[PDB]
Design a protein around this ligand. Structure first.
Ligand SMILES: */C=C/C(=O)N(C)Cc1nc2c(s1)CCCC2
Length: 180
């Protein structure tokens, strides 16, 4: 319905399959040549995007005001093409949601929509030994959720999937100011 209508339009215009030396990831293009990935993707000086070799001009791993990892990496891509600007769909404050859909898009898991249900505030989380901040939690019973993913609700882009414990998954919450 309307939730999936938004998620589908986001996929088409803003969610891309990428590959780094760390594997296959879902990338969210935010605007212009600016995109975001889970930090564990560890993008290098070049990246594969939809089967094309793209230079990475800048890569910034985001931290909070204490320097705590947010598990998000902002990259600026060496390209002429521009992403549709979706920042107006990213909330000003990290937001929970009901009936959320996780959009995964990698070469091995293309154009995949996963209903995760309610996304709830969690906060500080030790993610595979790395203290992380500003996380949210949802049901996601897989041990292989290590490809990123875009968490959406009706007309809102609320998180980037960063991992899980085999029962629940967790996302790094998105705020509009990250992309200002
Ligand atoms: C790294 C991609 C990812 O998130 N994986 C492989 C975990 C998932 N497995 C399935 C998903 S997401 C949705 C459909 C069922 C299998």
């Amino acid at each position: 319905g309307p939730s999936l209508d938004f998620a589908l339009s986001l996929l088409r215009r803003n969610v891309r399959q990428v590959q780094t030396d760390q594997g296959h990831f879902t990338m969210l293009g935010v605007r212009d040549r600016l995109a975001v990935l889970p930090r564990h993707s560890q993008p290098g000086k070049t990246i594969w995007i939809e089967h094309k070799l793209v230079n990475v001009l800048d890569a910034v791993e985001l931290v909070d005001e204490q320097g705590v990892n947010l598990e998000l990496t902002l990259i600026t891509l060496d390209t002429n093409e521009k992403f549709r600007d979706i920042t107006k769909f990213i909330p000003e404050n990290i937001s929970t949601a009901s009936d959320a859909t996780l959009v995964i898009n990698t070469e091995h898991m293309p154009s995949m929509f996963v209903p995760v249900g309610d996304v709830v505030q969690y906060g500080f989380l030790n993610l595979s030994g790395k203290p992380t901040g500003r996380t949210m939690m949802y049901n996601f019973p897989t041990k292989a959720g290590q490809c990123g993913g875009v968490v959406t609700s009706v007309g809102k882009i609320i998180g980037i999937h960063i991992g899980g414990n085999g029962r629940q998954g967790f996302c790094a919450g998105l705020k509009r100011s990250y992309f200002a």
